[PDB]
Each structure stands twice: as structure tokens, then as C-alpha cells.
Amino acid sequence: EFSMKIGIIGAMEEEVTLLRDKIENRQTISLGGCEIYTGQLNGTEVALLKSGIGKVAAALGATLLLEHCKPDVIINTGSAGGLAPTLKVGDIVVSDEARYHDADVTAFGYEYGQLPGCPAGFKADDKLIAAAEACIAELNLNAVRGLIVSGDAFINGSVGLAKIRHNFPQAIAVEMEATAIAHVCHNFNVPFVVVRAISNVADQQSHLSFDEFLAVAAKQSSLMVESLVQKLAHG
């Protein structure tokens, strides 16, 4: 397809810089505190947004990206804290869906993590997921697919981590933007998929590990997005 535009969202400069550097005929849109780089990745039109950290920042950015750029699909990239036992720093996690691990209106009968007016979780697009898995296989990378949960806190072991494992025993990774992006996408009916890499395991060593392994995570997730954009656009 020669008419599609793939949207990509990363929260930090370290997470979008590799991709930004590969954009052909790049230009930059500066709006509401966010930056969006337009151009093409090996011929495929893309709109890469640096959203900032956290749920609100990502929502605000995701909304602007959809409104000003109208991408057909959205891919959220960057690093995450690994929760699945087989995950090691560098490994890829693909979202089957996204849920807020810090949303709680259970007092009114909603299931934990669900906000009023929203489904309890947001489902990633089946085709995007299948495409991401193909890339994972073609690149011979270790990955895990499943539930990714977001919140506005950096998980670093202790109660923060345990509470999450307890409410979401099946969660494979934790971060701070995916569910806000999926929430916005859901409201606009835009297909999305989260493809991040592991930089820590959200335990008490998470900050030490994050600082040490963010670059390798950025590299691996960036490689995956580059490969995914190509696959989604031409097969």
C-alpha cells in the first residue's frame, strides 16, 4: 500500500531518537509541548511522536497525533519493566491488550483497573500483533505476548510491584503510557499495538537496571518498529 501512514509513539528522546534519525524527508511539528516528526521510513510514510512521560502526556500527545496527522494505525514503543519470568533485558514484549494497574473504581462495581465508560481492558489489533510476531521470528528475538499494564509510577519492587502481580497475575510487563495510548485509540477507533523492549524487571534494582539498559532496549524496540513498519506496508 502506497497511501498508508503509520503512527509511532515513544515517550523519551532516548526511545525515539534512533527512529527519528532514519526518517527520510523529515520535518518537525511542535504542538502543545510535544514533537512529531513526519517523513518516511524506507519509503513508508510515518508520523513519530515524542509524547513525554506518563498517562496524561501520552493521551494529550496521542490525541494531537490523531487529530493533526490521522495515522491509520499506532505503534507504541520504548522500554518496559519485565514481569513474565522468561523475560530478560533486551527482550521484546507485544501487547495482546492494555489495562491500567492503578485505576480503581471497584467501589462502584467496575472491575479493578477499569474506568467508567471504558472496557476493562483495551485490545491491541490482531493484524498488528500477527505482523509484530512475524518480525520477531524473522529477527530471531526472544519475546512474550500478553497483557501490558500502565500506571503513573515507576515500579521498583516493594509493595508497588507486589500489588501489581497480585491484581494482574497474567501481566507480562509494566510501564507508563501504553494504556493511555490504547484508551485514546479506542475512542477514535484506531488500531494499536505496543512493541517495547525490557530494560529492567520492575524490582528494587529497576532504577539501576533502567539506567544501564535503556539504550539496548531502545535499540531492540527500534529495530522491531523499523521491521514492523516495513512488514505492515509491503508484506
Q: CB-wise, 44 or 51, nearer to ligand MTA?
A: 51
Cβ neighbours around 217 below 10 Å, total = 26
Residue 167 CB partners (closer than 8 Å, separation 6+): 101, 112, 113
For residue 117, state whether it binds ligand MTA (rule: CB under 6 A): no
Instruction: Report the alpha-carbon distance of residue 77 to residue 8 in Å, rounded.
Output: 7
**Residue 18 exposure: Cα atoms within 13 Å on the Cβ side:** 18
For residue 184, state whether it binds its own copies (rule: CB under 8 A): yes
The residue written with cell numbers 528494587 in the block is 204
Residues 187-206, mask of contacts with ligand MTA (x by CB under 6 A): ------------xx-x---x
| Closest CB to ligand MTA: residue number | 81
Q: Which among 25, 50, 55, 18 is positioned nearest to 40, based on CA atoms? A: 25
List binders of its own copies among 50-109 (CB under 8 A): 52-57, 59-60, 62-64, 67, 100, 102-108
Q: Which does 117 bind (CB under 5 to 8 A by kind): ligand MTA, its own copies, none?
A: its own copies
User: Residue 164 in 3-state DSSP?
Assistant: helix
Instruction: Report the alpha-carbon distance of residue 47 to residue 20 in Å, rounded.
Output: 10
User: Residue 179 in 3-state DSSP?
Assistant: helix
Q: Which does 175 bind (CB under 5 to 8 A by kind): its own copies, ligand MTA, none?
A: ligand MTA
Q: Which residues contact its own copies by CB under 8 A?
A: 32-34, 52-57, 59-60, 62-64, 67, 100, 102-108, 115-118, 151-154, 156, 160, 179-180, 183-184, 187-188, 206-207
Residues that bind ligand MTA in the complex, under the rule CB under 6 A: 11-12, 53, 78-81, 105, 108, 116, 154-155, 174-177, 199-200, 202, 206, 210
